[PDB]
Design a protein around this ligand. Structure first.
Ligand SMILES: [Mg+2]
Ligand SMILES: [Mg+2]
Ligand SMILES: [Mg+2]
Ligand SMILES: [Mg+2]
Ligand SMILES: [Mg+2]
Ligand SMILES: [Mg+2]
Ligand SMILES: [Mg+2]
Ligand SMILES: [Mg+2]
Ligand SMILES: [Mg+2]
Lengths: 158, 79, 119, 137, 47, 94
RNA sequence: UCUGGUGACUAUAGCAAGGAGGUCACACCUGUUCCCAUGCCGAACACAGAAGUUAAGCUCCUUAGCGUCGAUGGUAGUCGAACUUACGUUCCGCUAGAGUAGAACGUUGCCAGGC
RNA sequence: CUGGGGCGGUCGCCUCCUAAAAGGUAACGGAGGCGCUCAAAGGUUCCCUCAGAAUGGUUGGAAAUCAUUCAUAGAGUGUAA
RNA sequence: UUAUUGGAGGUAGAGCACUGUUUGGACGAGGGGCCGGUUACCGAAUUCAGACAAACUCCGAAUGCCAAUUAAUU
């Protein structure tokens, strides 16, 4: 579809980030271990608890106070989690388009949103006490989004 | 009634260079006195705790540039 | 997209931070190490004149086999000390390049200690 | 009524007065202008009086620019005080001109209206002035 | 933030003087330092 | 486009520059393609009349000594008070 | 001369763009069995490899587009001298910053290999 | 001490400006700080490199966090400059 | 004391590359006229041109300062 001059020159995915979000812990410290348990249930890696970088006002924040979580999937764990998210997400979402018409930042990023609906696709709503959301970005070797549109069409719902 | 609130000053510290370029020095003499590092040390020159530059051996002293905008001091041997 | 940086230009930033307290002075010369992917190199340098003195290699025909990539590195360390034994078999300074003192760099240094050098 | 909104230091040394104009001595924005011939301070009340007398003669026709802004504060000690108990409070804001500096520029009007409008302004400044064109050649 | 004295077990006298504050380290701290009476290192404990 | 020039000698002092400007002359230099740095003299009144008939940006065939050079005008320093030109730089083009 | 390793030099050495180059060197690349490793990830680091590729790094050409360098001439300032009290003038030395012409797509020491 | 004296204010130490391209240099001249802290915020050996801006993205107080391109330190450096 | 060499340092002057100040003109994003939007207005950002500084400097003198020469005069 692009007529590549050499087979080494072809676009491919590189890394997927499973960064969750804030989870502002003024009193959600027990939920934070459960939010870590939610990511440890969603993905097969203990996520890096990303702490804050400032102490800004009008917010429950200071130097420290770990306010995030992220796990990086690169190899076969990225290859296995991408196949199950191709099937057990869109049937669990039931949307029209599914992600967006254009969500890249000029580089080829997916940046799909989540609102705790396809989350816990293994266990039912038994222990969950609050809603949440994940952010699944797709880092790839595409130069621009138009070349990435040929990559996003393969097993995608643009 | 009027008054002011500015009368304070510190005692001045006698900074700057102490030996000249081309001059023979003895092996422990202070070359330059500074806050921070306006001039780096070069050959046979030590750098003190309060950033004072001093000579290791006795010889003649040369000031010389280091990069684009950096300066250093060296002491060379034969007199 | 995603940009991979080459490993060699990151090494030289690490190498220049190392070689700032370290030099060869012709009483105590410097040997540095360069490994590419398939060979191991070694070279004695006096930094005061900028003149090198000795050299050994993995791709040299005198030492050329397919042992381990590590037993290869040992034979280089035995090789460089013999030419260092001709003159200046005194203490030297080991320049680790920009590498971790581990594995193939480490096996080169152990072979140089066990064959006459005094570092 | 021109004055800066905030200044880092309220009490400053007075500016150096001898010399010539550092720059800003060619008309660029308009067609005609008024340049200075001697040296003085201009204290931000003069350029309010001069700008008003400029404006009402042109009947709100073309545009008018001011090339001078009063940046420097000056102080004054109150009435009947002995010397030296600190430096007094501010009084006003001055700008320093030297021979060469353009003071006002007008445009969008005929030449003989511009001469008369600038003549009325010139009787309100403390400096000798002169009418100039837009230089070329 | 107080003055504090380290003393040897058998070095004879009380030489080294350091500082600490009581709120961060209320315990009796101890180090290995040099007393030249024995020409070695010995445990020195806060009195 | 037929202006005339006179080559200055070495090391003009301060006095003989302002004595040269109290006449109708203005100091100048020529440089550029195929030439070297030569410092010259030009009448002010003649220079204005040539500019006002060929424009600001035109070609002037001025003569230095014997030969004549096709020359454009690069820059000029102007005295805004007392309105006289005080320096002119000439650029050869071919 | 070509390639590589390693030093010296204020980017004239940089940045960007365009075009060619390879199993000799270099690198992507293959793999995680072993030393070793990731606040998670054999990505990185380390090790074991040599199927694949010049696409990228890299190297060689092309360009003055950005950055850098930059005279001559004039001017501002000023040491000394001479008149004067003018927001000064005159003489003689020194001589900027800005701007213009122009330079420039590196120069070079040591060793090994390939010539 | 004091532009008479009194009333007022100040008296030791650190850093800038005045200070006239070495150093030094006054005024009741202009601006600010100190009368500590740290058992690691010390020593050594190995790794790493920012704020900010732009662009995408559930919570989005606009900016918290995540990815991406630039970004001469503009970040940070116990405490004033 | 002078001649010749070498060096330290940031004044005068200039300049806007940082920090602050400021005048016009454009550009578009936002609120914003409206009937959510136009248009007007607002503030912020980015650019073109042009100005200011003792506690601003990408630059940077003259003079003075420190020294060394079997130099020359004292
Ligand atoms: Mg200007
Ligand atoms: Mg791999
Ligand atoms: Mg110049
Ligand atoms: Mg001085
Ligand atoms: Mg001084
Ligand atoms: Mg106080
Ligand atoms: Mg000035
Ligand atoms: Mg002043
Ligand atoms: Mg200044």
């Amino acid at each position: 579809k692009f007529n590549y001059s050499s087979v080494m020159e072809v676009p491919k995915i590189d890394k997927i980030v499973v960064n969750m979000g804030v989870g502002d812990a003024v009193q959600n410290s027990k939920v934070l271990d459960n939010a870590v348990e939610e990511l440890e249930l969603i993905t097969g890696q203990k996520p890096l608890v990303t702490k804050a970088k400032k102490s800004i006002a009008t917010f429950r924040l200071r130097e420290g106070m770990p306010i995030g979580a992220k796990v990086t999937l690169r190899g076969e764990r990225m290859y296995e989690f991408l196949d199950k998210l191709i099937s057990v997400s869109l049937p669990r979402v039931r949307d029209f388009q599914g992600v967006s018409k254009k969500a890249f930042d000029g580089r080829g990023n997916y940046t799909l949103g989540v609102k705790e609906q396809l989350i816990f696709p293994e266990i039912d709503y038994d222990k969950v006490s609050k809603v949440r959301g994940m952010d699944i970005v797709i880092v790839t070797t595409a130069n621009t989004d138009e070349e990435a549109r040929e990559l996003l069409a393969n097993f995608g719902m643009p | 009634v009027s008054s002011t609130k500015n009368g304070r000053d510190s005692e001045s510290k006698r900074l700057g260079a102490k030996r000249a370029d081309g001059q023979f020095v003895t092996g422990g003499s202070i070359l330059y006195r500074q806050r921070g590092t306006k001039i780096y040390p070069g050959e046979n020159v030590g750098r003190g705790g309060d950033d004072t530059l001093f000579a290791k051996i006795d010889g003649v002293v040369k000031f010389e540039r280091k990069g684009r905008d950096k300066k250093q001091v060296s002491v060379y041997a034969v007199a | 997209m995603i940009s991979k940086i080459d490993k060699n230009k990151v090494r030289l930033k690490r190498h220049a931070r190392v070689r700032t307290n370290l030099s060869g002075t012709a009483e105590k010369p410097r040997l540095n190490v360069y490994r590419s992917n398939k060979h191991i190199y070694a070279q004695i340098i006096d930094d005061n004149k900028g003149v090198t003195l000795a050299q050994a290699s993995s791709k040299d025909s005198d030492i050329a086999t397919t042992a381990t990539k590590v037993e290869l590195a040992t034979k280089v360390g035995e090789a460089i000390a013999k030419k260092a034994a001709d003159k200046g078999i005194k203490e030297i300074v080991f320049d680790r390049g920009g590498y971790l003192y581990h594995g193939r760099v480490k096996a080169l240094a152990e072979a140089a200690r066990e064959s006459g050098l005094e570092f | 009524m021109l004055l800066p909104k905030r200044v880092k230091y309220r009490r400053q040394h007075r500016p150096k007065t001898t010399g010539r104009s550092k720059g800003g001595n060619y008309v660029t924005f308009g067609e005609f202008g008024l340049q200075a011939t001697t040296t003085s301070w201009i204290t931000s009340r003069q350029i309010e009086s001069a700008r008003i007398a400029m404006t009402r003669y042109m009947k709100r026709g073309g545009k008018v620019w001011i090339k001078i802004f009063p940046h420097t504060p000056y102080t004054k000690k109150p009435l009947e005080v002995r010397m030296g108990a600190g430096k007094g409070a501010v009084e006003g804001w001055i700008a320093v001109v030297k021979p060469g500096r353009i003071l006002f520029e007008v445009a969008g009007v005929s030449e003989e209206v511009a001469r008369e409008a600038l003549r009325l302004a010139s009787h309100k400044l403390p400096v000798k002035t002169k009418f100039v064109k837009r230089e070329e050649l | 933030r107080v003055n504090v004295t380290l003393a040897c077990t058998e070095c004879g006298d009380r030489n080294y003087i350091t500082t600490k504050n009581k709120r961060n380290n209320p315990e009796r701290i101890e180090m290995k330092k040099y007393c030249p009476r024995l020409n070695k290192y010995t445990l020195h404990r806060e009195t | 486009a037929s202006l005339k020039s006179i080559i200055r000698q070495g090391k003009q002092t301060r006095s003989d520059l302002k004595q040269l400007r109290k006449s109708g002359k203005v100091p100048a230099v020529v440089y550029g393609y195929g030439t070297k740095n030569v410092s010259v003299k030009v009448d002010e009144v003649e220079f204005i009349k040539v500019i006002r008939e060929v424009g600001r940006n035109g070609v002037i065939e001025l003569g230095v000594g014997s030969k004549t050079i096709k020359v454009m005008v690069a820059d000029y320093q102007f005295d805004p008070l007392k309105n006289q030109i005080t320096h002119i730089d000439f650029l050869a083009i071919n």
